[PDB]
């Protein structure tokens, strides 16, 4: 108490700027708290991060900081500030200050039904942000309701780029049933068949899953485990056609799909009855089995369904593509801590 602040145990400083600390939750190796940007007189959001122990926790922390700091879009959360010790030796944790939000799509969907006007505007915002993210050659890779924060003005902001990668379509193939870290339910089908998740189409499939969940207040493909996820997807889209199967040259995946009993397509309007017809048509294009035929972000924005919002001159793209001077993951826990230290240097006086 005579120095750092304690919130339900554990320390949680902010220096002489953020006050009125109020628990806001947690999640994993990090504690969140609303407070008070005494400078801006607003209650910011502060996440307590301490990854220097786990090497991977350090890389997710770095690219999240790198990406967010270099990005600037109304539909992407930003980093207002970052609190850390003055020395690398003294730095145990790192605090990131971010515009506070009222809730997230996950929590919202848990109790409030969405109106079409609400669904349309949310989708438009998800896609408007994604076009900027993809324009920077970056893939979010973990798009799901819990990563979409909203405030009381219904404004939406994409967050959580801990698993984001710089696109790389040329090095995307891989063998059948290749492990993945991203949230199962919103995982594209090709992930379980022969994709590393290095193409932009991976993000669009996720958004499609979000669209569906917003239409029904329940996850469209809630696969219990890794392979069940694919089984869920196929129960609705039906068996892939000859063409779609041909794109898959990887034999193991192809033979798996072929060993399966044929099943027909489950109609969308039958899955979501009192749901806009134009929306379901966009949902169809998004949840396309073949990654190559899947609609692209800019294409989706120009869909009749989003006509009342579509305005390309008001849908910004990044000043320049993104790249991490490591790409391949592998990088020592120490160095990472050093890189994190310098990446957060701009917020330190002297
Ligand atoms: C960066 N950030 C901005 N607003 C919030 C916020 N706003 C409201 C809030 C409070 C409690 C639960 C969900 C949402 N909650 C969280 N995370 C808490 C873990 O869910 N992070 C935020």
Swiss-Prot record:
Keywords, sorted A to Z: Acetylation, Apoptosis, ATP-binding, Cell cycle, Cell junction, Cytoplasm, Cytoskeleton, Kinase, Membrane, Nucleotide-binding, Nucleus, Phosphoprotein, Serine/threonine-protein kinase, Transferase, Ubl conjugation
Binding residues annotated for ATP, in chain numbering: 24-32, 47
Keyword Electron transport assigned: no
CDD domains membership: STKc_ERK1_2_like
Protein kinase domain segment(s): 18-306
Alphabetical GO biological process terms: androgen receptor signaling pathway; animal organ morphogenesis; apoptotic process; B cell receptor signaling pathway; Bergmann glial cell differentiation; cardiac neural crest cell development involved in heart development; caveolin-mediated endocytosis; cell surface receptor signaling pathway
MF terms in GO: ATP binding; double-stranded DNA binding; identical protein binding; kinase activity; MAP kinase activity; mitogen-activated protein kinase kinase kinase binding; phosphatase binding; phosphotyrosine residue binding
Alphabetized Pfam families for the sequence: Pkinase (PF00069)
Catalysis: reaction(s): L-seryl-[protein] + ATP = O-phospho-L-seryl-[protein] + ADP + H(+); L-threonyl-[protein] + ATP = O-phospho-L-threonyl-[protein] + ADP + H(+)
Resulting phenotype, residue 150 to A: Reduced affinity for DCC
A single Gene Ontology CC term: perikaryon
Cofactor(s) recorded in Swiss-Prot or TrEMBL: Mg(2+)
Chief subcellular location: cytoplasm
Subcellular locations according to the entry: Cytoplasm, Cytoskeleton, Spindle; Nucleus; Cytoplasm, Cytoskeleton, Microtubule organizing center, Centrosome; Cytoplasm
PTM entry text: Dually phosphorylated on Thr-178 and Tyr-180, which activates the enzyme. Phosphorylated upon FLT3 and KIT signaling. Ligand-activated ALK induces tyrosine phosphorylation. Dephosphorylated by PTPRJ at Tyr-180. Autophosphorylated on threonine and tyrosine residues in vitro, which correlates with a slow and low level of activation. Phosphorylation on Ser-22 by SGK1 results in its activation by enhancing its interaction with MAP2K1/MEK1 and MAP2K2/MEK2. Dephosphorylated by DUSP1 and DUSP2 at Thr-178 and Tyr-180. ISGylated.
Comment on protein domains: The TXY motif contains the threonine and tyrosine residues whose phosphorylation activates the MAP kinases.
Annotated family: Belongs to the protein kinase superfamily. CMGC Ser/Thr protein kinase family. MAP kinase subfamily.
Biological function: Serine/threonine kinase which acts as an essential component of the MAP kinase signal transduction pathway. MAPK1/ERK2 and MAPK3/ERK1 are the 2 MAPKs which play an important role in the MAPK/ERK cascade. They participate also in a signaling cascade initiated by activated KIT and KITLG/SCF. Depending on the cellular context, the MAPK/ERK cascade mediates diverse biological functions such as cell growth, adhesion, survival and differentiation through the regulation of transcription, translation, cytoskeletal rearrangements.
Quaternary organization: Binds both upstream activators and downstream substrates in multimolecular complexes. Interacts with ADAM15, ARHGEF2, DAPK1 (via death domain), HSF4, IER3, IPO7, MKNK2, MORG1, NISCH, PEA15, SGK1, and isoform 1 of NEK2. Interacts (via phosphorylated form) with TPR (via C-terminal region and phosphorylated form); the interaction requires dimerization of MAPK1/ERK2 and increases following EGF stimulation. Interacts with MAP2K1. Interacts with DUSP6. Interacts with ARRB2.
Protein name per its UniProtKB record: Mitogen-activated protein kinase 1
């Amino acid at each position: 108490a005579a120095g750092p602040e304690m919130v339900r145990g554990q320390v949680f400083d902010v220096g002489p700027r953020y006050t009125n600390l109020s628990y806001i939750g947690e999640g994993a190796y990090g504690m969140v708290c609303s407070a008070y940007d005494n400078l801006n007189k607003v209650r910011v959001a502060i996440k307590k991060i301490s990854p220097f122990e786990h090497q991977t926790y350090c890389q997710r922390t770095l690219r999240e900081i790198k990406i967010l700091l270099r990005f600037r879009h109304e539909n992407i959360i930003g980093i207002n500030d970052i609190i850390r010790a003055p020395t690398i030796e003294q730095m145990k944790d790192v605090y990131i200050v971010q515009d506070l939000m009222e809730t997230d799509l996950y929590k919202l969907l848990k109790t409030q039904h969405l109106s079409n006007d609400h669904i349309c505007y949310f989708l438009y915002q998800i896609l408007r942000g994604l076009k900027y993210i993809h324009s920077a050659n970056v893939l979010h890779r973990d798009l799901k309701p819990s990563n979409l924060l909203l405030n009381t003005t219904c404004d939406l902001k994409i967050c959580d780029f801990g698993l984001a990668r710089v696109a790389d379509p040329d090095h995307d193939h891989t063998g059948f049933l290749t492990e993945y870290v991203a949230t199962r339910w919103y995982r594209a089908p090709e992930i379980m068949l022969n994709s590393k998740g290095y193409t932009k189409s991976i993000d669009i499939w996720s958004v499609g899953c979000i669209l569906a969940e917003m239409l029904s207040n329940r996850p469209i493909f809630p696969g219990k485990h890794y392979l069940d996820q694919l089984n869920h997807i196929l129960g609705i889209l039906g068996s892939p056609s000859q063409e779609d199967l041909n794109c898959i040259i990887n034999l193991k995946a192809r033979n798996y799909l072929l060993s399966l009993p044929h099943k027909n397509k489950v109609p969308w309007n039958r899955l979501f009855p009192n749901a806009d017809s134009k929306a379901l048509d966009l949902l169809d294009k998004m949840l396309t089995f073949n990654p190559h035929k899947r609609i692209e972000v800019e294409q989706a924005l120009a869909h009749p369904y989003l006509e009342q919002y579509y305005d390309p001159s008001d849908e910004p793209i990044a000043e320049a593509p993104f790249k991490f001077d490591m790409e391949l993951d592998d990088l020592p826990k120490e160095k990472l801590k050093e890189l994190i230290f310098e990446e957060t240097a701009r917020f330190q006086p002297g």
